């Protein structure tokens, strides 16, 4: 089963991208749940929408929010995904995946991905920030993997390592930084585990996705790091804890992520900044120094 | 990936289903390997093969044995699942699934599930029932899940939650119940595990589904009991233990399920009686107390 | 879903096979990563490039190296494969697997199955050889499995026993023949887990693996062995360790399996020794004594 998409069509989309903007971004930052909020923080943002670049899997269902804006955080050239794609709604990991790629193309080196979790370590406040450490890919365990067909050595290699995912630099250089802003509450740290399927974990499921040493919990972040480390790109991630998974029986109160009031407002608003003064740390190509 | 079924679809099939039969059940039962022997019991019965309902998933190879057959047992009308289907036969979930939306429709508010697991807790004998108290879907943990597609929600959320899944009430209600009767050999309760494929669990398997903390294992149950809360059905089930799953290494004796003799004969004669005075337990929409 | 291949399929490439070829194998061997070294043993040794046989799922990009070259090898008659396929390489597990079911047409009735894992227990040095005691099928875990479809009462039954895959005798026999030619280090015991995907488990990863209790781990091996069981064939098989998977943070040092220069020719000759001397402690038909 090769990917539907063929190099050209990457080609293609890429060169597109780059004769409708002046822009040329160093960093592509993929935005989760309630925290497209980042775009904001923009200049020079030029936003297009999926809908509007020849290949882009469109969006579906949920809302008017999911667009591709470019401009200038901090310094450094970004590229910012509002609005990712999950396996829960239909589409073949060839599709979440199908941004990174054109990122790659566009000659992006570095690539920061958010996403909002459930933290299953009893250590952990809804609101937290978690660095993404490592991951657990459940769905690639059976073969539910990005990677799944003939190699594109242009791309990459067929089998590329992973214990090395998640930049040690950009995660030592993040942990000095939250010293430097000097915050309340701790930066976490942890394992990230995907979980395909909409429904959310039951509680003995819980129980096996702790045992199994994970920090937090979601559905996405994985696919997009495989085949962004699979083309040699830096990547560093953290995750928002929202929710925090019951790992007994009970009564559930909880219902929102962000929907509520400042669930997401609160938290989802230092990380902004976080992610924001962190464009700093990153190295830039023109290495002059 | 959306499912090939569209809403019209269901309307459709409940609606003939409600213009072939007088009969409005307000519970669904689900029978499982050598349980259509409960369809026995019941009064006003009206059987319809799947291959009459305008969408139904006809059946495969196996036998003659895989109907819907409406009726009255003790007191509430039912509507009852004589061979359900499995993803081992190679249907898409949203295939094995799609009795339960129209049970939906029906009008039906509880759905009784039943099965017959492997037991992997080590006390437990063949003959056991097993009040299944929650679930660990490993397909799931994967994408392959029911509700994987664009949601629907004239069914229902997108983000459904199920620590929650089989009832609290139904599941004292029940406990009390074998009081009542006054058994011999006491009703277990455990976790379920699903595990697709046909072939069965080698002893490595037995030893992780065990580490997982699970008590039975089977090839079903999950899916639909999954969109059945999507759609917001009382769930309550139990499991018939008929092997023992063997954790270390030996020579295994065992070949069979009800195939012997009385194997599922005697141990599915107490399931199909204490389902039925169970039925007396089941609210009664007329709630005019 | 049911196999996209007829029996009548098998039929017709057995068949041809058997119209090509004045050899009639009693044992398939399936060669791995860097031990295709072993067709070069045999004997009135007569090959077959898969493009060639008439249904043969063709090979991929890699390289020249896969074809089917029947022999004799100490004694017995076998048909060796040179180059499987894998699920990375995007084939269904009907494709991986249809060799095994050609070979019972041809008349095998033992199949030994080599691979090159990545060790896991914490006593192995690459260069080892493990005896696979077991398996741990994760893809099957949800539905990935070979025999999920209608089932084919001509192959085998609906529900295969997996307690036994992997010969006790052929497993002793084994044991026994590493004293006899008196070898240095120790032939190995273990479990095998199979994960499917292209890139390579990461730490977190490694560490499920190992709690799950596996010794070593690919991307090969089960599908082959669960219908080639499925078929009444005695199945035994050996793992070549390579790597030496990392369960700690670390700067991995690591590139190959045999590439570099020795690392499967040092290590891969003494399987290819072992096997070439295992011929013979298997039952020969012709069973005269």
Redesign the interface.
């Known amino acids: ?2 990917n539907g998409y063929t190099y050209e069509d990457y080609k293609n989309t890429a060169e597109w991208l780059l004769s409708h903007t002046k822009h040329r971004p160093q960093v592509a930052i993929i935005c989760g749940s309630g925290l497209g909020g980042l775009t904001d923080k923009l200049t020079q943002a030029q936003i297009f929408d999926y809908s509007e670049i020849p290949n882009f899997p469109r969006s ?3 809302g008017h929010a999911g667009r591709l804006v470019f401009g200038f955080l901090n310094g450094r050239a970004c590229v910012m995904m509002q609005g990712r794609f999950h ?6 990991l060839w599709k979440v995946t199908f941004p990174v790629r054109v990122f790659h193309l566009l000659g992006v080196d570095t690539l920061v991905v958010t996403n909002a979790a459930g933290g299953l370590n009893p250590k952990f406040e809804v609101g937290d920030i978690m660095l993404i450490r ?12 990005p ?5 594109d050595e242009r791309f990459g290699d ?8 998640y930049d040690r630099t950009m995660r030592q250089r993040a942990l000095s930084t939250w010293k430097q802003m000097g915050e309340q509450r701790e930066l976490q740290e942890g ?1 990230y ?1 995907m ?11 819980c ?2 996705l702790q ?4 920090d937090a919990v979601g559905m996405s972040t994985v696919p997009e790091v ?1 085949v962004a480390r ?1 083309c040699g790109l830096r990547v560093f991630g953290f995750s928002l804890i929202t929710n925090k998974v ?1 790992m007994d029986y ?1 009564s ?1 109160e909880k219902a929102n992520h962000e929907e509520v009031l400042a669930a997401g407002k609160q938290a989802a608003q230092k990380l902004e900044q976080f992610v924001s003064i962190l464009m700093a740390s990153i190295p830039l190509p023109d290495k002059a120094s």
């Open positions: 089963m090769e579906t269902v949920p396996m829960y709604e239909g589409y073949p490592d991951h657990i890919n459940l769905p690639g365990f059976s073969g539910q993997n990677l799944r067909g003939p190699n067929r089998f590329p390592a992973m214990s090395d995912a394992t585990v979980v395909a399927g909409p429904s959310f974990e039951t509680v003995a499921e129980r096996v045992k199994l040493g994970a495989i699979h019951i009970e559930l």
